[PDB]
Amino acid sequence: DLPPIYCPLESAIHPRVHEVEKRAVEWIRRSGMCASEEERAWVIATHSADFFARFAPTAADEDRLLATSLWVYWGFAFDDHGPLSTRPAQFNALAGRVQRALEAPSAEDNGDRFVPALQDIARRFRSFGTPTQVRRFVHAHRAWLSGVAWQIGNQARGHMPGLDDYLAMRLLSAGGEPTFAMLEIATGAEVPDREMHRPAVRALTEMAIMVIALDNDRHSLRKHTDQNIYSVLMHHRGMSLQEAVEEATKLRDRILLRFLELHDRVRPGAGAELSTYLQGLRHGIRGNAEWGLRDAPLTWAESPSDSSPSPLPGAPSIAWWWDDALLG
Amino acid sequence: VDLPPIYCPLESAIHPRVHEVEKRAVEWIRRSGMCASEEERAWVIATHSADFFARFAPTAADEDRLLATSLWVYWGFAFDDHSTRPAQFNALAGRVQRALEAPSAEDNGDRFVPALQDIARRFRSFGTPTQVRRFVHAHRAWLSGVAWQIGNQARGHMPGLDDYLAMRLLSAGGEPTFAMLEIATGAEVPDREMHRPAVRALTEMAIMVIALDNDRHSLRDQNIYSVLMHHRGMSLQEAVEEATKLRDRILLRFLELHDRVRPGAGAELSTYLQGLRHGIRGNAEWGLRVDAPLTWAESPSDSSPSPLPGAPSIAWWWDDALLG
């Protein structure tokens, strides 16, 4: 099992990653996010500065890379530590309160450990980004919390989503959206509304997010009714773990090929800011996989395990990624 | 039981082609396959939602954009009104929101999806992709609210004031409603103007006043009256007078900030802001009628310029230093 990852994309890391990691650890200790020192050590152990420094490896301002890096840490923390992990009614309200604290500086925590921390991140994002960029992050942020709400709903009932619902869900629950909405904030490069919201750019962003979500599901086979591509396929298709491992890799490789074919057609015409955003998507895909396999020599697959130029069978909710009349 | 007149010194108007739009919308609702029982579809038709939204965009040059936007209002009443346990809802919001963002998404026997996807297609043939994403994000924000409200209900959590006002911001469906003014008008608001805090604040304040006017339309399950009675130990009448003072103080702040922002605003942000105003008044007026003369309070029941205490989620509406 576990054949090497197909990832023919640029790998790079911010030359100031060590300095930014140092500050992030310091922020985390004063963040009051986590109860014990033992937990904070888990949050530090995510090496989320190493991670987000692979997405924005030429960020001119160490401060913007630090601010965005902080959210990746806050992100892990929020998701791991729960009592709410099969209590969707309570989570719906937590989600609402936390999302509100992101949009309303005046909002008060109510002994919620996470809120003041998020509110510090938000204060940073307003210092750096335009109100437009902040809203892009806020909206992405709620998108993610809708994903998590969906996933927690499923856990409560013991619902194993099928392929369509599972892929739809993970675009959101895996944190891809708020992660990519921080590119602009890290780099400074304000992508205009006309370009950022082209269907073709939306598709590329989702495809980037979906490959990262599937790389993460693969990364979580290093441990049975947990919600992941493997369980989904074993349930709905009657496959063995090994057969589903091969199917997962076929699907994921097909999405990545589409991402590269659409990138190859969009990028030539892209303006400077969109081009920088699109390099982030690529640096992100590769950075995720690389960060997941941790300077030991790493093996990659030279070819994909499936190169069908058409949409995924059984996943109509993503078929539009392949429809060029609806895009560019 | 005894209820004062509403303070609402805002322009009242309704699209001149409203009757022709209702005609077409009634017909789409018959051909929508949304509610099976015809009896149900009559409940939807009797929202008179075209009449509601014709008040928000009364000079909209294209009758088809006012039709498209009006369908969504019917859809929202139909979806929200008439499986809805929190766990199943989180999945249901997930799918419906995905069907709005992804035209290739397949109904899978859900009755609301094909109809929302028809609305989406119309929105995509009129609005720029920018205008559609604003509506999309607004639509999720509402679904997040309805999820919050369904959560509290199933657990027996009466929220405090702050939480209730935050929730209702979303669950009233004011965001998706106001995110349709641009799609009705065709007046493209540039991002540097739309995402100004000042404009966010004017948009949320219009939304909150609509949500609190809607609450007053229910004294005839979570509402400001229930919330204030539970957390402050008021009678129904102690809380009706308290609810009116919060609302009237929010609408005062709305008029104040509008008067600061409006002279500088460009043609398109200006159309939007008149849309906020037409919207608040339309909602109040539509609330009563659903047609002989209405009475209005000439004066606010509480003209304090300060932020509401015990509602820090909304205090920033009043902080000018933060509305650069």
Author numbering:
A (entry chain A): 9 to 89, 94 to 235, 241 to 311, 327 to 360
B (entry chain B): 8 to 89, 97 to 234, 243 to 312, 327 to 360
Paste lines from the article:
Spiroviolene synthase (SvS) from Streptomyces violens was first described by Rabe et al. and represents a bacterial class I diterpene cyclase that we were not able to produce in sufficient quantities for crystallization due to protein instability.
One representative variant of each group was subjected to crystal structure analysis, and Cα rmsd values in the range of 0.35–0.68 Å compared to the parental SvS-A2 structure indicated that none of the variants had significant conformational rearrangements. The single residue exchange Ala224Ile (group IV) reverses substrate preference of the reconstructed ancestral enzyme and enhances specific activity for FPP approximately 3–5-fold (Malachite Green assay/GC-FID) compared to the reconstructed ancestral enzyme. Spiroviolene formation could not be detected for this variant so that a ratio of apparent second order rate constants cannot be derived. The isoleucine in this position is conserved in the two bacterial sesquiterpene cyclases SdS and HecS (Ile220 and Ile217, respectively),31,51 indicating that it may be a specificity switch of general importance in directing bacterial terpene cyclase sesquiterpene specificity. Steric effects are also likely to play a role, since the larger size of an isoleucine side chain permits sesquiterpene binding while hindering the correct positioning of the bulky diterpene substrate in the active site. The Ala224Ile exchange reverses substrate preference, and due to its conservation in a functionally related sesquiterpene cyclase, we speculate that it may represent a general specificity switch in bacterial terpene cyclases.
